[PDB]
Amino acid sequence: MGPREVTMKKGDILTLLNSTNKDWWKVEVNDRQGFVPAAYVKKLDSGTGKELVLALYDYQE
């Protein structure tokens, strides 16, 4: 907890923590938590109970 600089590669599947904001979603990358653009990821249908997103493009601040 406590937003930190996270990055992602196209194809990564991240655990979604908070998608209340339409533009920036909080996710767990490795053992770190941060924000990624909502437009760069897609909510997946499965991994039930746990929320998962697929990274569509690379991202780094």
CB 40 within 8 A of CB 55: yes
Range of the domain at 56: 1-61
- β-bridge partners, 27: 16, 34
The answer to whether 13 touches 27, Cβ cutoff 8 Å, is no
Q: Is the dihedral of CA 35, 39, 41, 44 positive or negative?
A: positive
Asked if residues 17 and 4 have their Cβ atoms less than 8 Å apart, the reply is: no
**CATH code assigned at 10:** 2.30.30.40
- Is residue 29 within 8 A of residue 6, CB to CB? The reply is yes
Number of structural domains the chain divides into: 1
- CA-based nearest residue to 17, from 9, 41, 58: 41
| Distance, CA of 4 to CA of 1 (rounded, Å) | 8
